[PDB]
């Protein structure tokens, strides 16, 4: 979000006796399925958990997360079960459904950029 | 380390135990290799004759 440049390394000094600021922490997991044809293992699902204020010098927060999101897709050949979206809205879950792997990757990258974890 | 080798996708090969070989293949999980290319071996250079060796005459050798 903010950028600056120093002409020479001389222009930089240090103070050490100030408390560190809180950080953003993301913990994510993913699912893979082996490509039947040849030599690939595709990504079919992801789930991440985010905390926007993680104290480095204090006790761990409880709960360790505030927000989360999830994504799912179909590899190349299978199709989602009939009325998948109906079931999704029926059970009130924050699951974003994607068509191909490329859309899933784009969504993941957009979320990573927007949240901007450390 | 030891890994299993899968030869389903290998067209031409000739293998015996103890052969030092160089393979090219896919190993995605790290517990099994699907071989796709087998590099051929290369022999040692022949003996280089001297000037004396070309002056020898015809000889007969028997082997039993």
DSSP string, chain B: ----EE-TT--S----TT----EEEE-SSSS-EEEEEEPPP-PPPPP---TGGGG---------
Tokens of A63: 């709960």
C-alpha torsion sign, points A90, A96, A102, A105: negative
Nearest of A34, A35, A30, A33 to residue A45 by alpha carbon: A30
Please name which of B37, B42, B43 lies closest in space to residue B7, comparing C-alpha atoms.
B37
Please state, in angstroms and rounded to a whole number, the distance separating the CA atoms of residues A31 and A41: 10
Instruction: Find the discontinuities in chain A where C to next N exceeds 2.5 angstroms and give the residue preceding each.
Output: none
Which bin fits A92, alpha (ψ -120 to 50), beta or left (φ > 0)? Answer: left
Q: Does B10 touch chain A (CB under 8 A)?
A: no
Q: Which residues lie closer than 8 Å to A101 by C-beta, 6 or more apart? A: A42, A43, A44, A73, A75
Q: Report the candidate in A16, A72, A65 with the shortest Cα–Cα distance to residue A47.
A: A72
What technique determined this structure?
cryo-EM
A109: three-class secondary structure by DSSP: helix
The answer to whether the CB atoms of B26 and A41 lie below 8 A apart is no
Cβ–Cβ of A41/B28 closer than 8 Å? Answer: yes
Give the Cα separation of A47 and A94 in Å (integer).
11
- Best B10, B28, B34 member to test A by mutation, with max A CBs in 10 Å, is B28
How far is the C-alpha of B16 from the C-alpha of B64, rounded, in Å? 29
Torsion angle, CA of A7/A12/A18/A21, rounded to 10 degrees? 30
Query: Touching check for B14 and chain A: CB below 8 Å?
Result: no
């Amino acid at each position: 979000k903010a950028e600056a440049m120093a002409l020479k390394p001389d222009l930089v000094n240090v103070i050490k006796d100030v408390s560190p600021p809180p950080l953003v922490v993301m913990a994510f997991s993913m699912k893979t399925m082996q490509n039947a044809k040849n030599h690939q293992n595709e990504i079919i699902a992801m789930a991440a958990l985010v905390h926007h204020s993680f104290a480095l010098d204090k006790a761990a927060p409880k709960p360790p997360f505030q927000s989360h999101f999830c994504v799912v897709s179909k590899p190349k050949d299978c199709i989602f079960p009939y009325a998948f979206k109906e079931v999704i809205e029926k059970k009130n879950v924050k699951v974003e459904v994607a068509a191909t792997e490329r859309t899933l990757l784009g969504f993941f990258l957009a979320k990573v950029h927007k949240i901007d974890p450390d | 380390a030891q890994i299993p080798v899968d030869l389903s996708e290998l067209k031409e090969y000739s293998l015996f135990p103890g052969q030092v070989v160089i393979m090219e293949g896919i190993n995605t999980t790290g517990r099994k290799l699907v071989a796709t290319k087998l590099y051929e071996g290369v022999p040692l250079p022949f003996y280089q004759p001297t000037e004396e060796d070309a002056d020898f005459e015809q000889s007969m050798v028997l082997v039993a």
